[PDB]
Design a protein around this motif. Structure first.
Motif, PDB file in Angstrom:
ATOM      1  N   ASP B 134      25.131   0.843 -62.753  1.00 11.77           N
ATOM      2  CA  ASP B 134      25.360   0.314 -64.107  1.00 11.77           C
ATOM      3  C   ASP B 134      24.237  -0.624 -64.604  1.00 11.77           C
ATOM      4  O   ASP B 134      24.312  -1.179 -65.690  1.00 11.77           O
ATOM      5  CB  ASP B 134      26.768  -0.308 -64.235  1.00 11.77           C
ATOM      6  CG  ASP B 134      27.010  -1.445 -63.261  1.00 11.77           C
ATOM      7  OD1 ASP B 134      28.154  -1.933 -63.156  1.00 11.77           O
ATOM      8  OD2 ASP B 134      26.067  -1.862 -62.578  1.00 11.77           O
ATOM      9  N   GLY B 135      23.201  -0.813 -63.791  1.00 10.68           N
ATOM     10  CA  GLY B 135      22.027  -1.613 -64.172  1.00 10.68           C
ATOM     11  C   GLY B 135      22.219  -3.081 -64.524  1.00 10.68           C
ATOM     12  O   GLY B 135      21.427  -3.639 -65.282  1.00 10.68           O
ATOM     13  N   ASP B 136      23.248  -3.717 -63.974  1.00  9.40           N
ATOM     14  CA  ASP B 136      23.528  -5.122 -64.266  1.00  9.40           C
ATOM     15  C   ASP B 136      22.879  -6.090 -63.270  1.00  9.40           C
ATOM     16  O   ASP B 136      23.079  -7.300 -63.358  1.00  9.40           O
ATOM     17  CB  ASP B 136      25.049  -5.376 -64.376  1.00  9.40           C
ATOM     18  CG  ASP B 136      25.836  -4.919 -63.122  1.00  9.40           C
ATOM     19  OD1 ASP B 136      25.217  -4.763 -62.039  1.00  9.40           O
ATOM     20  OD2 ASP B 136      27.086  -4.702 -63.197  1.00  9.40           O
ATOM     21  N   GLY B 137      22.107  -5.562 -62.320  1.00 12.15           N
ATOM     22  CA  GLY B 137      21.538  -6.398 -61.265  1.00 12.15           C
ATOM     23  C   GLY B 137      22.522  -6.863 -60.204  1.00 12.15           C
ATOM     24  O   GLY B 137      22.147  -7.607 -59.309  1.00 12.15           O
ATOM     25  N   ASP B 144      31.466  -1.140 -58.995  1.00 11.19           N
ATOM     26  CA  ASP B 144      30.972   0.119 -59.561  1.00 11.19           C
ATOM     27  C   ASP B 144      29.768   0.676 -58.806  1.00 11.19           C
ATOM     28  O   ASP B 144      29.375   1.827 -59.006  1.00 11.19           O
ATOM     29  CB  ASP B 144      30.777  -0.024 -61.080  1.00 11.19           C
ATOM     30  CG  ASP B 144      32.142  -0.109 -61.818  1.00 11.19           C
ATOM     31  OD1 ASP B 144      32.395  -1.102 -62.540  1.00 11.19           O
ATOM     32  OD2 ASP B 144      32.997   0.805 -61.629  1.00 11.19           O
ATOM     33  N   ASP B 145      29.224  -0.138 -57.891  1.00 14.46           N
ATOM     34  CA  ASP B 145      28.266   0.354 -56.912  1.00 14.46           C
ATOM     35  C   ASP B 145      28.929   0.532 -55.545  1.00 14.46           C
ATOM     36  O   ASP B 145      30.071   0.099 -55.336  1.00 14.46           O
ATOM     37  CB  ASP B 145      27.086  -0.587 -56.838  1.00 14.46           C
ATOM     38  CG  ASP B 145      26.210  -0.484 -58.070  1.00 14.46           C
ATOM     39  OD1 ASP B 145      25.722   0.622 -58.332  1.00 14.46           O
ATOM     40  OD2 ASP B 145      26.017  -1.495 -58.756  1.00 14.46           O
ATOM     41  N   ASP B 146      28.214   1.185 -54.636  1.00 14.19           N
ATOM     42  CA  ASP B 146      28.732   1.474 -53.311  1.00 14.19           C
ATOM     43  C   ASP B 146      27.830   0.873 -52.202  1.00 14.19           C
ATOM     44  O   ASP B 146      27.828   1.365 -51.076  1.00 14.19           O
ATOM     45  CB  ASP B 146      28.913   2.992 -53.141  1.00 14.19           C
ATOM     46  CG  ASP B 146      27.632   3.780 -53.395  1.00 14.19           C
ATOM     47  OD1 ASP B 146      27.659   5.030 -53.317  1.00 14.19           O
ATOM     48  OD2 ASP B 146      26.567   3.179 -53.673  1.00 14.19           O
ATOM     49  N   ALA B 147      27.068  -0.167 -52.542  1.00  4.61           N
ATOM     50  CA  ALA B 147      26.162  -0.830 -51.591  1.00  4.61           C
ATOM     51  C   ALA B 147      27.014  -1.540 -50.552  1.00  4.61           C
ATOM     52  O   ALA B 147      28.087  -2.026 -50.884  1.00  4.61           O
ATOM     53  CB  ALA B 147      25.291  -1.856 -52.309  1.00  4.61           C
ATOM     54  N   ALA B 148      26.518  -1.629 -49.312  1.00  6.85           N
ATOM     55  CA  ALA B 148      27.119  -2.484 -48.275  1.00  6.85           C
ATOM     56  C   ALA B 148      26.951  -3.969 -48.626  1.00  6.85           C
ATOM     57  O   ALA B 148      26.013  -4.330 -49.354  1.00  6.85           O
ATOM     58  CB  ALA B 148      26.470  -2.193 -46.920  1.00  6.85           C
ATOM     59  N   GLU B 149      27.852  -4.814 -48.114  1.00  6.06           N
ATOM     60  CA  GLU B 149      27.834  -6.278 -48.336  1.00  6.06           C
ATOM     61  C   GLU B 149      27.267  -7.012 -47.109  1.00  6.06           C
ATOM     62  O   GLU B 149      26.816  -8.171 -47.170  1.00  6.06           O
ATOM     63  CB  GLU B 149      29.253  -6.766 -48.628  1.00  6.06           C
ATOM     64  CG  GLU B 149      29.648  -6.613 -50.136  1.00  6.06           C
ATOM     65  CD  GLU B 149      29.741  -5.162 -50.598  1.00  6.06           C
ATOM     66  OE1 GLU B 149      29.507  -4.913 -51.803  1.00  6.06           O
ATOM     67  OE2 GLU B 149      30.047  -4.237 -49.787  1.00  6.06           O
ATOM     68  N   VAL B 150      27.286  -6.306 -45.988  1.00  2.68           N
ATOM     69  CA  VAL B 150      26.746  -6.850 -44.753  1.00  2.68           C
ATOM     70  C   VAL B 150      25.933  -5.752 -44.079  1.00  2.68           C
ATOM     71  O   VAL B 150      26.343  -4.598 -44.042  1.00  2.68           O
ATOM     72  CB  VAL B 150      27.872  -7.285 -43.818  1.00  2.68           C
ATOM     73  CG1 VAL B 150      27.289  -7.948 -42.529  1.00  2.68           C
ATOM     74  CG2 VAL B 150      28.871  -8.234 -44.547  1.00  2.68           C
ATOM     75  N   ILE B 151      24.789  -6.126 -43.506  1.00  2.18           N
ATOM     76  CA  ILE B 151      24.023  -5.185 -42.681  1.00  2.18           C
ATOM     77  C   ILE B 151      23.892  -5.815 -41.298  1.00  2.18           C
ATOM     78  O   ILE B 151      23.448  -6.967 -41.169  1.00  2.18           O
ATOM     79  CB  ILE B 151      22.637  -4.869 -43.277  1.00  2.18           C
ATOM     80  CG1 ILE B 151      22.743  -3.886 -44.446  1.00  2.18           C
ATOM     81  CG2 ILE B 151      21.731  -4.271 -42.206  1.00  2.18           C
ATOM     82  CD1 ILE B 151      21.477  -3.870 -45.306  1.00  2.18           C
TER      83      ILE B 151
END
Ligand SMILES: [Ca+2]
Ligand SMILES: [Ca+2]
Ligand SMILES: [Ca+2]
Ligand SMILES: [Ca+2]
Ligand SMILES: [Ca+2]
Ligand SMILES: [Ca+2]
Ligand SMILES: [Ca+2]
Ligand SMILES: [Zn+2]
Ligand SMILES: [Zn+2]
Ligand SMILES: [Zn+2]
Lengths: 65, 318
Positions: B134-137, B144-151
């Motif tokens: 959604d391009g909100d940074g 709405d993104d599917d990025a991990a929160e912890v690596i």
């Protein structure tokens, strides 16, 4: 061929020029201006010399901790 | 399948009492584990495996034969974070949290820098292949993104100042908490990537709160890393020791903090810094709620001390 990681200036690097020197693109990073390429060990000079190419990293081994 | 037991390290980091608030099953939260892969159908893991990927040889693959753990290290680490709370096996720190298993290492635990960098990128991009749809940074903590929160990184090596470190920095900047083992040589300082300021270096304690003799010194925090029972291939269980077994306890604790904070506030906490002693970032909260062992304050053995989910969550929510 050897596998290398090329830092590029996206405004000047032409990825289609890679094929000419006998290389192919393996993976283009979406989040940093870099591309992994397979290139004959001897076109590395030609690669480093291509416009927009800023740095050529060899692939290095990682090991499990 | 054996009847479920709670490994001692799970109680030491004060996880089970958090589960009435959250077990980590807040849908926006994923933990990506960059390791040897996962036993994807293990009965005590399967329901939590949200994405099983491999970046080996620079090819992103979800084929089962590419992503399946051939070593066991990834399976064990994943188990400590996220083994299901049920009638069998063990139970993770965050037994309801979604896992991305990102295989970056082969059967012998060998890999290449390029595959590790691609693995970090994959953890940020998530299964949709796009970091910020959604391009909100907002990347981590954006539903709405599917990025991990912890690596959680099971790598050790010398300093890198290349595209690989650049990729770690991109993950940090995306709001992702990065965790890594200090190393297993009893050395005076952490290995990389644990040694980077963007990454939490984790040391290992035994059940008597002694720092393990193998634990590389100057960590940021410490956690259970001796006699750690967890899942292991094939649908089995194994006891291992290492700062690498300590690492997933911390990753699980971070997952609980972010899940509970998001559940309350609809956003996540910023990652923060190694120096942080505020309640306003993940690392701040981890540092101030840790059990301060050894000499008062940060020390070269324990770091800030032993992480504690119950106290961390209380701080985050208050
Ligand atoms: Ca997420
Ligand atoms: Ca279980
Ligand atoms: Ca994505
Ligand atoms: Ca977004
Ligand atoms: Ca958004
Ligand atoms: Ca299995
Ligand atoms: Ca101390
Ligand atoms: Zn090739
Ligand atoms: Zn190099
Ligand atoms: Zn290990």
């Amino acid at each position: 061929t050897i596998r290398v990681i090329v830092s590029v200036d996206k405004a000047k690097f032409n990825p289609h020029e890679v094929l000419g020197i006998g290389g192919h693109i393996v993976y283009q990073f979406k989040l940093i201006p870099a591309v992994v390429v397979d290139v004959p060990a001897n076109a590395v000079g030609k690669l480093k010399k291509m416009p927009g190419v800023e740095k050529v990293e060899f692939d290095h081994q990682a090991v499990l901790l | 399948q054996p009847a479920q037991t709670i490994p001692w390290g799970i109680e030491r980091v004060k996880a089970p009492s958090v589960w009435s608030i959250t077990d980590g099953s807040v849908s926006v939260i994923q933990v990506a584990v960059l390791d040897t892969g996962v036993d994807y159908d293990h009965p005590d893991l399967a329901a939590n495996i949200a994405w099983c990927v491999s970046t080996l040889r620079g090819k992103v693959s979800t084929k089962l034969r590419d992503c399946a753990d051939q070593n066991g290290h990834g399976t064990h680490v994943i188990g400590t974070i996220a083994a299901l709370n049920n009638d069998i096996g063990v139970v993770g720190v965050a037994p309801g949290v979604q896992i991305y298993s990102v295989r970056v290492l082969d059967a012998r635990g060998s890999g290449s820098y390029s595959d590790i960098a691609i693995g970090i990128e994959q953890a940020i991009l998530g299964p949709d292949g796009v970091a910020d749809k959604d391009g909100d940074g907002i990347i981590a903590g954006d539903p709405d993104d599917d990025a991990a929160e912890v690596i959680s990184m099971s790598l050790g090596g010398p300093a890198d100042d290349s595209y690989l470190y650049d990729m770690i920095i991109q993950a940090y900047n995306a709001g992702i908490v990065i965790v890594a083992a200090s190393g297993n040589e009893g050395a005076p300082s952490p290995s990389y990537p644990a040694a980077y300021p963007e990454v939490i270096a984790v040391g290992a304690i035994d059940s008597n709160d002694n720092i393990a003799s193998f634990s590389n010194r100057q960590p940021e925090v410490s956690a259970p890393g001796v006699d750690i029972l967890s899942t292991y291939p094939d649908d089995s269980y194994e006891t291992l020791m290492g700062t690498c077994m300590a690492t997933p306890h911390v990753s699980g604790v971070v997952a609980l903090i972010q899940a509970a904070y998001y559940q309350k506030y609809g956003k996540i906490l910023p990652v923060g810094t190694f120096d942080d002693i505020s309640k306003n970032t993940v690392r701040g909260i981890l540092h101030i709620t840790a059990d301060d062992l050894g000499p008062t304050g940060w020390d070269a053995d324990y770091g800030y001390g032993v992480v504690r989910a119950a106290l961390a969550v209380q701080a985050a929510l208050g």
